[PDB]
């Protein structure tokens, strides 16, 4: 399985690991996974994670040929499973230092899902991003501005927790991933940059 591949100790995953736009897998509602884990899904997740530090540390991103990345969810893999890792850096401030906490959510999760969400509606206002995408799309991608989601992690520890701004809309694609949902399916068919009333626009 393209799964074999991932795992072996020395495989460093890249571009060539992610399939695209038209693989059947990315339109599947992916598998639960039972606990305890399997050897196969601790190790994806890690794979997995090590992948998005390697796709933001400017060198590696680099040697490696890598497009910076918040998020990656198995069916991007050609495994249909329901995991994804999500990360997502604090910046700098404009004197250059360093924020307090690195990153506003780091975390491998496990049969995550949206439990409860806002009424109010939330986009990206640059848009957003694909790995598996080689087109310039263009518009806005709405989502629930707020999200509750539970998940388990690789211990099978379930977590609750609520989320808003930038850090909602990630895990919003990420968990859209394990469901067959791409993104241009909630950019608006008639006008890309309809902007209905009260639609927050994150900027
Ligand atoms: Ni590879
Ligand atoms: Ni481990
Ligand atoms: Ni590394
Ligand atoms: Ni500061
Ligand atoms: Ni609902
Ligand atoms: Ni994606
Ligand atoms: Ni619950
Ligand atoms: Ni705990």
Do not use: W
Request: hydrophobic share 40%; aromatic share 6%.
């Amino acid at each position: 399985a393209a799964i074999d591949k991932l795992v072996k100790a020395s495989h460093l995953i890249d571009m060539n690991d992610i399939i695209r736009e038209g693989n059947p897998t990315l339109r599947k509602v992916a598998e639960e996974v039972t606990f305890p884990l399997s050897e196969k899904e601790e190790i994806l997740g890690e794979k997995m994670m090590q992948f998005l530090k390697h796709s933001q540390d400017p060198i590696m991103a680099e040697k490696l040929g890598l497009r910076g990345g918040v998020g990656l969810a198995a069916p991007q893999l050609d495994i249909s499973k329901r995991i994804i890792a999500v990360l997502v850096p604090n910046v700098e401030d404009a004197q250059g230092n360093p924020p307090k906490e690195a990153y506003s959510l780091q975390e491998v999760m496990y049969n995550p899902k949206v439990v409860s969400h806002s009424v109010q509606d939330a986009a990206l206002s640059d848009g957003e991003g694909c790995l598996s995408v080689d087109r310039e799309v263009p518009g806005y991608v709405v989502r629930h501005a707020r999200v509750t989601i539970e998940y388990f992690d690789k211990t099978g520890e379930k977590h609750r927790l609520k989320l808003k701004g930038y850090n909602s809309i990630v895990v919003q694609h990420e968990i859209d991933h394990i469901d067959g949902i791409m993104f241009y399916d909630r950019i608006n068919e008639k006008n890309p940059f309809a902007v209905k009333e009260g639609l927050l626009i994150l900027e």
